Amino acid sequence: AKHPVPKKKTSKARRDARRSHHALTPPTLVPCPECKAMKPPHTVCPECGYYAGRKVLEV
Amino acid sequence: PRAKTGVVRRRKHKKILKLAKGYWGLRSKSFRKARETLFAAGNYAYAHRKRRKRDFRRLWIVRINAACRQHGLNYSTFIHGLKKAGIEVDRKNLADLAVREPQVFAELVERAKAAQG
Amino acid sequence: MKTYVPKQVEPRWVLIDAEGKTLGRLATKIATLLRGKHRPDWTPNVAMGDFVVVVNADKIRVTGKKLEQKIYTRYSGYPGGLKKIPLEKMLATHPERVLEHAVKGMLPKGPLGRRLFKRLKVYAGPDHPHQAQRPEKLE
Amino acid sequence: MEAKAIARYVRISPRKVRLVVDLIRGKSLEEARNILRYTNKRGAYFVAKVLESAAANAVNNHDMLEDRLYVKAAYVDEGPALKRVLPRARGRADIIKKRTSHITVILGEKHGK
Amino acid sequence: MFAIVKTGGKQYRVEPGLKLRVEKLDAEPGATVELPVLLLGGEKTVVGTPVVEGASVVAEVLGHGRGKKILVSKFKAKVQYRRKKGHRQPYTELLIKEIRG
RNA sequence: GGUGAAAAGAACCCCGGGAGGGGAGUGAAAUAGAGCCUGAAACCGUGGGCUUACAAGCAGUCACGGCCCCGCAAGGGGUUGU
RNA sequence: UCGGGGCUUAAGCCCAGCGCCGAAGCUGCGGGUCUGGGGGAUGACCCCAGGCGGUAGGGGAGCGUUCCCGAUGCCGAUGAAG
C-alpha cells in the first residue's frame, strides 16, 4: 500500500525456484529394542518404552 | 442482425500461438507476447537470409586464405592469381575442394602462380 | 550445398621461438595461436595460448620506451571479452607473466586459471616436464 | 495393475501437501505408513488417511497384497478454493483465499516378474 | 571423380552418379539433361579461361519440385507495417548421369 | 439457463469420524453420476524423453552439432551445447 | 583505455605501385508484381521495355462472421457444428 510495491510481475521460473529451496524434509526413526516399532531417536516409543519398562498403554 | 463473434479471433490467435511454441518466457505462454516476439523472430529470419549469404562469404574467404598460408603466400595474391589469368569463376566456396582433396588444390595453386607470376 | 566438416583434426603441438624478437609481431602468427591482439569471442582459453607456451621460457626485451612496469595483457580468448593476464604485480599472481605476455604472461591469474589454468608455468621453461613437437614451427 | 484411489474436495493448500506427496513418492508401504504417522504436520496423518483409502482398494478390491504394494504416484493439485473478504485497518477490504488438493495416491506392482 | 559446373548462378562440384536439385529449370520433366558446360573431373582436370569445353557433363532429371516455404513475415516496430507473406521457392530435381569430359 | 429419451438418479459390500472414493447394477452412453452437453486459454500440477552449475541476458533468429521419438529411402520432430 | 589489444626498417607520417577485401547497390539464375507493346479474332497464354522506399492519406482487391433466398432441397449414426 505504501512504498515497496512490486515493480513488475515475477516469472514462474523464479517463483518455483524460490519455492525450490524448500524440498520437504523427512523425520527420523530407529527401531525399539524387543519390539516392532520405529521410535524417534533417543525417544522412547509410545508403547514399549525404555529399559525397566513403564507406561505401556498405547494400544 | 448480430454477428456473434465466435471463433475467428481465437483461431488466428492460436495460429500465431501455434507459431510461437518452442520458446522460453511467458512469451511461450502468453498470446499477445508470443505474437510480438514472433514478429521479431521474422525480422531476424530475413536479416539472416542475406547475412547467411555474407557470413558464408566470410568462412569461404577464411579457410581458403588459411590453406594459402599453410602453403606459401596469402589471400589477395591468390585472388589476382585467379582473376587476372583468365579463370573468371571458381565459386570461392567450390575451391573447398582444397583440404577435402589437397591434390587438385596444390595444382591449381600452381595455376594461379603460373599465369600471374 | 557444401561440406567442410573436419571433425577433431587432433592437437597441433607447436612451440615456436622468437622470444628475443618483437612485441606485437610477437603475436599475429604466434597469435593465430595467441593474442596481444588476435582471437577472442567467448572461447579460446589460455590453452592453445600455451602450446607455444612461449616455450622459449620467458621475457627478453622491448621495442619502445614504456619499461619498468609490465608483463602483459587483454585479448587472449574466452569469455570476459578477450582476455589475458595483467603485468608484473602479477609476476607475482601465481606463476609470473613474461613475453609469455603472450602466454605465461597471459595465464598466472587464478580465473583463466580456470581455463584449466591448466596449461602452463615455468613449466613452459622448455623443460615443461613434457613432450611436444620440436620442429615447433621454429619458423 | 496400478491401484487408483482418491479423495477429492478436501483441505490443505497446494504447496504444502504437494511437497508431502513428493516427500514419500517412490517408497513402499511400510515406510509410507510409519512416515505419515510421524511428521510434524496435518497432511501427515491426513494424506495417511487417504492412503488408507488407497490401501483397501488394492488389498481387498484389487488384491495385490500389502507387501507388493509400493507407492505409485499421488498427484494432488489445487482444485477450487475459498474466497473470503478480510477486514483490515483503514477501511481496507481485501480478498484472501483457501486453496485445495486432489490427492491421487496410487499403489502398485512389486518386482514385475 | 568430381566435376565443376556453373548452373543457374549456382556453382557445384557434382559427382558422377547421385545428387538431387538445381534452380528452377525450363527443361524436360523426366528426360535427358545434357549439360553443355563442365569445369572439372577427378585426377587433375583444370578449367580453362572460359568453361571446360573438351566435352560436357551429363545429368538425368527425375521431375520438378518445390522446397520448404518461408513465410516472409517482416513487420515494423511502431507506426504500423505488418507484412504477412510467404514465398515457396520453385525448383527442379535431378540426378546426374556422368561427366563425359 | 443443459444428466437422460425416461431417475432407471447408483441398492449390497470395501478405506474413513464422516466428506470422498473402490467393486456393482443400471441405461447406447456413468469424463451423461447429481449442479451431471461442449469443455480453449490464462493460471495451477505427474511421470518421463531432451538440456542447463565458467557464467554478462528485448532470451529470439541463422549455420553446425549431441540426444529422444516418428520415416523404407532421403527425411523429420523437437531438445539447445558452439 | 585510441573500439580495445597493441604497434617504432611501423601496424605513425610522406610519395609511388599492383592485388584483393568489402553494401538488399550491380552480374547470372529463379519466383512475384503492376504497367506499356505485339502476336493474342482467341479468353488464355507466350514473348518482349520498365518501375516496386513507403507513414498519413488515394485506389484496386482478397478471407471470414449472424441471418434471408438457393430449400416441401443436399450432406449427417457408417456420426453436425465447436
Swiss-Prot record, chain A:
Compositionally biased tracts (Basic residues): 1-22
Keyword Isomerase: no
GO biological process assignments: translation
Keywords from the named record: Ribonucleoprotein, Ribosomal protein
Domain of life: Bacteria
Residues annotated as signal peptide: none
Record bears the keyword Ribonucleoprotein: yes
Region (Disordered) location: 1-29
GO molecular function, one term: structural constituent of ribosome
Disulfide pattern: none
Record GO cellular component, one term: large ribosomal subunit
SUPFAM superfamilies cross-referenced by the UniProt entry: Zn-binding ribosomal proteins (SSF57829)
Quaternary state and interactors: Part of the 50S ribosomal subunit.
Family listed: Belongs to the bacterial ribosomal protein bL32 family.
Stated role: Found on the solvent side of the large subunit.
HAMAP family reported in the protein's UniProt record: Ribosomal_bL32
Name recorded for this polypeptide: Large ribosomal subunit protein bL32
Organism: Thermus thermophilus (strain ATCC 27634 / DSM 579 / HB8)
Curated annotation (Swiss-Prot), chain C:
GO BP term (any one): translation
Domain of life per record: Bacteria
Lineage: Bacteria, Thermotogati, Deinococcota, Deinococci, Thermales
Family, per entry: Belongs to the universal ribosomal protein uL13 family.
Keyword annotations: Ribonucleoprotein, Ribosomal protein
Gene Ontology CC: cytosolic large ribosomal subunit
Molecular function via GO: mRNA binding; structural constituent of ribosome
InterPro entries with a match to the protein in the record: Ribosomal_uL13, Ribosomal_uL13_bac-type, Ribosomal_uL13_CS, Ribosomal_uL13_sf
Cross-referenced Pfam families: Ribosomal_L13 (PF00572)
Subunit structure and binding partners: Part of the 50S ribosomal subunit.
Function (record text): This protein is one of the early assembly proteins of the 50S ribosomal subunit, although it is not seen to bind rRNA by itself. It is important during the early stages of 50S assembly.
Record gene name: rplM
Entry protein name: Large ribosomal subunit protein uL13
Curated annotation (Swiss-Prot), chain D:
An annotated GO BP: translation
Pfam families with a match to the protein in the record: Ribosomal_L22
GO CC entries: cytosolic large ribosomal subunit
SUPFAM superfamilies listed in its UniProt record: Ribosomal protein L22
Coiled coil (UniProt feature): none
Molecular-function annotations in GO: rRNA binding; structural constituent of ribosome
Xref: CDD domains: Ribosomal_L22
Ribosomal protein in keyword set: yes
Keywords: Ribonucleoprotein, Ribosomal protein, RNA-binding, rRNA-binding
Complexes and interactors: Part of the 50S ribosomal subunit.
Function: This protein binds specifically to 23S rRNA; its binding is stimulated by other ribosomal proteins, e.g. L4, L17, and L20. It is important during the early stages of 50S assembly. It makes multiple contacts with different domains of the 23S rRNA in the assembled 50S subunit and ribosome.
Family: Belongs to the universal ribosomal protein uL22 family.
Protein name per the record: Large ribosomal subunit protein uL22
UniProt source species: Thermus thermophilus (strain ATCC BAA-163 / DSM 7039 / HB27)
GN (gene name): rplV
Swiss-Prot record, chain E:
Keywords: Ribonucleoprotein, Ribosomal protein, RNA-binding, rRNA-binding
Pfam families linked to this entry: Ribosomal_L21p (PF00829)
GO biological process: translation
GO cellular component, one term: ribonucleoprotein complex
Recorded GO MF terms: rRNA binding; structural constituent of ribosome
Assembly: Part of the 50S ribosomal subunit. Contacts protein L20.
Family: Belongs to the bacterial ribosomal protein bL21 family.
Function: This protein binds to 23S rRNA in the presence of protein L20.
HAMAP family associated with the record: Ribosomal_bL21
This protein's name: Large ribosomal subunit protein bL21
Organism: Thermus thermophilus (strain ATCC BAA-163 / DSM 7039 / HB27)
